[PDB]
Amino acid sequence: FNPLSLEELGSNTGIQVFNQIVKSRPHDNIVISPHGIASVLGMLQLGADGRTKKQLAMVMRYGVNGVGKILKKINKAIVSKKNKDIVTVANAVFVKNASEIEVPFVTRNKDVFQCEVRNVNFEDPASACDSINAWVKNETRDMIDNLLSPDLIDGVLTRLVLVNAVYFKGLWKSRFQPENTKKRTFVAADGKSYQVPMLAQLSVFRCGSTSAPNDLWYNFIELPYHGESISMLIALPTESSTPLSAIIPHISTKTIDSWMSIMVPKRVQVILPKFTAVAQTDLKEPLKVLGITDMFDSSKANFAKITTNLHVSHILQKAKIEVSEDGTRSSPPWFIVDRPFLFFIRHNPTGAVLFMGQINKP
Q: From CA 129, how far away is CA 120, in angstroms rounded?
A: 9
Solved with: X-ray
The total domain count for the chain is 2
Q: From CA 238, how far away is CA 62, in angstroms rounded?
A: 38
Q: Are strands 182-187 and 115-119 parallel, antiparallel or unpaired?
A: unpaired
Contact yes or no for 115/91 (Cβ under 8 A): yes
- 16: in domain: no
- 17: in domain: no
Whether 83 and 117 share a structural domain: yes
Whether 327 and 305 share a structural domain: no
Whether 107 and 251 share a structural domain: no
- 26: in domain: no
Whether 151 and 285 share a structural domain: yes
Domain of 238 in residue numbering reads as 168-277+321-332
Q: From CA 362, how far away is CA 352, in angstroms rounded?
A: 25
Whether 243 and 140 share a structural domain: no
- 347: in domain: no
Which phi and psi angles does 159 have, rounded to 5°? Answer: -130, -20
CA-based nearest residue to 229, from 267, 277, 173: 173
Q: From CA 44, how far away is CA 42, in angstroms rounded?
A: 5
Whether 136 and 255 share a structural domain: no
Q: Domain holding 262: CATH number?
A: 2.30.39.10
Whether 315 and 218 share a structural domain: no
Q: From CA 28, how far away is CA 154, in angstroms rounded?
A: 28
Resolution of the experimental structure, in angstroms: 2.3
Residue type, position 62, single letter: Y
Whether 66 and 158 share a structural domain: yes
Q: Domain holding 124: CATH number?
A: 3.30.497.10
- 134: in domain: yes
Which phi and psi angles does 186 have, rounded to 5°? Answer: -115, 125
Residue type, position 13, single letter: T
- 48: in domain: yes
Whether 263 and 306 share a structural domain: no
SS (H, E, C) the chain: CCHHHHHHHHHHHHHHHHHHHHHHCCCCCEEECHHHHHHHHHHHHCCCCHHHHHHHHHHHCCCCCCCHHHHHHHHHHHHCHHHCCCCEEEEEEEECCHHHCCHHHHHHHHHHHCEEEEECCCCCHHHHHHHHHHHHHHHCCCCCCCCCCHHHCCCCCCCEEEEEEEEECCCECCCCCHHHCEEEEEECCCCCEEEEEEEEEEEEEEEEEEECCCCCEEEEEEEEECCCCEEEEEEEECCCCCCHHHCCCCCCHHHHHHHHCCCEEEEEEEEEECEEEEEEEECHHHHHHCCCCHHHCCCCCCCCCCCCCCCCCEEEEEEEEEECCCECCCCCCEEECCCCEEEEEEECCCCEEEEEEEECCC
Whether 232 and 282 share a structural domain: no
Whether 127 and 191 share a structural domain: no
* Number of C-beta neighbours around residue 212 at 10 A: 18
Going 336 to 338 to 344 to 346, the CA torsion angle's sign is positive
- 66: in domain: yes
- 19: in domain: no
Whether 126 and 176 share a structural domain: no
How far does Cα 59 stand from its chain's mean position?
18
